[PDB]
Write a protein that holds these residues in place. Structure first.
Motif, PDB file in Angstrom:
ATOM      1  N   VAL B 138      12.122   8.570  -1.102  1.00  0.00           N
ATOM      2  CA  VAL B 138      11.863   7.267  -0.491  1.00  0.00           C
ATOM      3  C   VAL B 138      10.792   7.477   0.579  1.00  0.00           C
ATOM      4  CG1 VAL B 138      12.806   5.274   0.678  1.00  0.00           C
ATOM      5  CG2 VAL B 138      14.229   6.547  -0.962  1.00  0.00           C
ATOM      6  N   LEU B 139       9.547   7.118   0.246  1.00  0.00           N
ATOM      7  CA  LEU B 139       8.425   7.299   1.171  1.00  0.00           C
ATOM      8  C   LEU B 139       8.527   6.370   2.368  1.00  0.00           C
ATOM      9  CD1 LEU B 139       5.490   7.350  -1.382  1.00  0.00           C
ATOM     10  CD2 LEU B 139       6.582   9.343  -0.291  1.00  0.00           C
ATOM     11  N   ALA B 140       8.864   5.103   2.124  1.00  0.00           N
ATOM     12  CA  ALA B 140       9.017   4.118   3.185  1.00  0.00           C
ATOM     13  C   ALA B 140       9.939   3.040   2.650  1.00  0.00           C
ATOM     14  CB  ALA B 140       7.675   3.509   3.619  1.00  0.00           C
ATOM     15  N   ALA B 141      10.673   2.393   3.552  1.00  0.00           N
ATOM     16  CA  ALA B 141      11.621   1.389   3.082  1.00  0.00           C
ATOM     17  C   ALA B 141      11.877   0.358   4.168  1.00  0.00           C
ATOM     18  CB  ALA B 141      12.943   2.031   2.647  1.00  0.00           C
ATOM     19  N   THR B 159       4.677  -0.667   3.797  1.00  0.00           N
ATOM     20  CA  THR B 159       3.397   0.001   3.665  1.00  0.00           C
ATOM     21  C   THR B 159       3.575   1.495   3.868  1.00  0.00           C
ATOM     22  OG1 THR B 159       2.903  -0.392   5.982  1.00  0.00           O
ATOM     23  CG2 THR B 159       2.021  -1.968   4.392  1.00  0.00           C
ATOM     24  N   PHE B 160       2.682   2.260   3.248  1.00  0.00           N
ATOM     25  CA  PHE B 160       2.729   3.711   3.357  1.00  0.00           C
ATOM     26  C   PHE B 160       1.337   4.289   3.153  1.00  0.00           C
ATOM     27  CE2 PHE B 160       3.172   8.032   1.607  1.00  0.00           C
ATOM     28  CZ  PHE B 160       3.919   8.621   2.620  1.00  0.00           C
ATOM     29  N   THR B 161       0.962   5.242   4.013  1.00  0.00           N
ATOM     30  CA  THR B 161      -0.311   5.940   3.883  1.00  0.00           C
ATOM     31  C   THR B 161      -0.037   7.379   3.467  1.00  0.00           C
ATOM     32  OG1 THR B 161      -1.599   4.550   5.374  1.00  0.00           O
ATOM     33  CG2 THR B 161      -2.282   6.856   5.150  1.00  0.00           C
ATOM     34  N   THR B 163      -1.397  11.103   2.895  1.00  0.00           N
ATOM     35  CA  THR B 163      -2.424  12.045   3.325  1.00  0.00           C
ATOM     36  C   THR B 163      -2.633  13.140   2.280  1.00  0.00           C
ATOM     37  OG1 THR B 163      -0.889  13.535   4.443  1.00  0.00           O
ATOM     38  CG2 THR B 163      -1.695  11.626   5.702  1.00  0.00           C
ATOM     39  N   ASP B 165      -2.088  16.176   2.576  1.00  0.00           N
ATOM     40  CA  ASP B 165      -1.026  17.169   2.668  1.00  0.00           C
ATOM     41  C   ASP B 165       0.354  16.604   2.336  1.00  0.00           C
ATOM     42  OD1 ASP B 165      -0.690  15.649   5.053  1.00  0.00           O
ATOM     43  OD2 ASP B 165       0.233  17.383   6.038  1.00  0.00           O
ATOM     44  N   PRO B 167       3.565  16.134   0.425  1.00  0.00           N
ATOM     45  CA  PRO B 167       4.106  17.052  -0.585  1.00  0.00           C
ATOM     46  C   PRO B 167       4.420  16.414  -1.930  1.00  0.00           C
ATOM     47  CG  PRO B 167       5.721  16.616   1.147  1.00  0.00           C
ATOM     48  CD  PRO B 167       4.464  15.945   1.575  1.00  0.00           C
ATOM     49  N   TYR B 168       4.295  15.093  -2.069  1.00  0.00           N
ATOM     50  CA  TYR B 168       4.698  14.392  -3.281  1.00  0.00           C
ATOM     51  C   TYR B 168       3.523  13.774  -4.025  1.00  0.00           C
ATOM     52  CZ  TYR B 168       8.842  14.946  -0.459  1.00  0.00           C
ATOM     53  OH  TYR B 168       9.833  15.449   0.353  1.00  0.00           O
TER      54      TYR B 168
END
Ligand SMILES: [Ca+2]
Ligand SMILES: [Ca+2]
Ligand SMILES: [Ca+2]
Ligand SMILES: [Ca+2]
Ligand SMILES: [Ca+2]
Lengths: 197, 200
Positions: B138-141, B159-161, B163, B165, B167-168
């Motif tokens: 879950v990157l963002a929720a 929203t999610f940024t 980068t 680096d 890991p996913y």
């Protein structure tokens, strides 16, 4: 109108030297440890939490601490995916109906290097507002925070008369998600305010 | 190099078509799977078991003071167990994968159904969570951040940024729409799922 929180800016204990830190649970808080990632006895390099002084000369931030001298940090040494840990505080105030709660906390992404280990990168954060053991509302990593910076997370919640968790104690959790490296992050200036709704 | 929509199957729950207003299915909507981490939803459902499905919200509807946010239908999740028993909802894994130096914007309309159904009050709300995934992470929720009155929809935005680096990177993107089961009436609706990506 504020709901009081103990050690809300992690200003206890006083730290004299810039960038010095403790490795024990900050006074007034407990270690949220659902995956047993954090040991009871810590070192600089175990998974740990504590408080740190951000002042002039800091090597980790592009600004002073959001509030006072100190921030609260959480570092997790296990690999990404291993679980979460952080800070938790149960308050004396209880969940009341027709009332709107506003939780604000500053979230910090430390930059720079420590003992020649890069602090670049971020583990992800979650800020939770609780009644009892129930997460009423939470910001799961919605803000993009660059290395060396802080941003304010805001979580709001309105309880209706039919809410199942009325009269339970309010709580706050500040969580390191361990979803990236470097796997440390900081928090400061926890505020909980309340108004009729 | 600009704002692009990422394709989502049955993104407004318009499949299947439903002729009668306020009628509904009780099976997993095409294009989606049932998110069932606590095994609250049975494989075979009726009206008053735990279930999910689609529902036509048009003129005549007893449940809202507005029509469906998009098209004819919404997607719903209903849970019969007591508050605290777990969560369930919808999940869809996408063909697109997580890419660096990109900003993702997930939007979905969340509905708090009102009124009455079979003399049961629909007053109250279970709470929701909207999740953006890469792989199993879950990157963002948005965990229940909007207050939504009975009879209305509100738009949730995540929203999610990503980068370089992260890991996913290169894992498949996913979406979950979740009933938190933290209140009664323990049903809620979703509509108009949208995901865009843009240079960060
Ligand atoms: Ca402080
Ligand atoms: Ca960092
Ligand atoms: Ca700030
Ligand atoms: Ca629709
Ligand atoms: Ca309702």
């Amino acid at each position: 109108v504020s709901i009081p929180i103990n050690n809300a800016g992690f200003e206890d204990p006083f730290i004299e030297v810039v960038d010095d830190y403790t490795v024990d649970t900050p006074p007034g808080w407990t270690t949220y440890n659902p995956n047993n990632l954090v040991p009871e006895k810590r070192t600089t390099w175990t998974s740990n939490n504590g408080v740190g002084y951000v002042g002039p000369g800091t090597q980790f931030y592009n600004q002073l601490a959001p509030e006072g001298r100190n921030i609260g940090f959480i570092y997790l040494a296990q690999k990404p995916g291993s679980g979460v840990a952080g800070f938790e505080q149960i308050l004396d105030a209880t969940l009341e109906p027709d009332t709107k709660y506003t939780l604000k906390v500053d979230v910090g992404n430390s930059g720079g290097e420590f003992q020649k280990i890069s602090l670049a990168g971020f583990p992800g954060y979650r800020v939770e507002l609780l009644a009892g053991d129930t997460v009423l509302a939470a910001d799961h990593n919605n803000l993009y925070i660059k290395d060396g910076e802080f941003k304010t997370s805001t979580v709001t919640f309105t309880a209706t008369p039919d809410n199942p968790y009325l009269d339970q104690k309010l709580g706050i959790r500040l969580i390191n998600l361990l979803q990236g490296t470097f796997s440390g992050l900081d928090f400061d200036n926890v505020r909980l305010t309340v108004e009729p709704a």
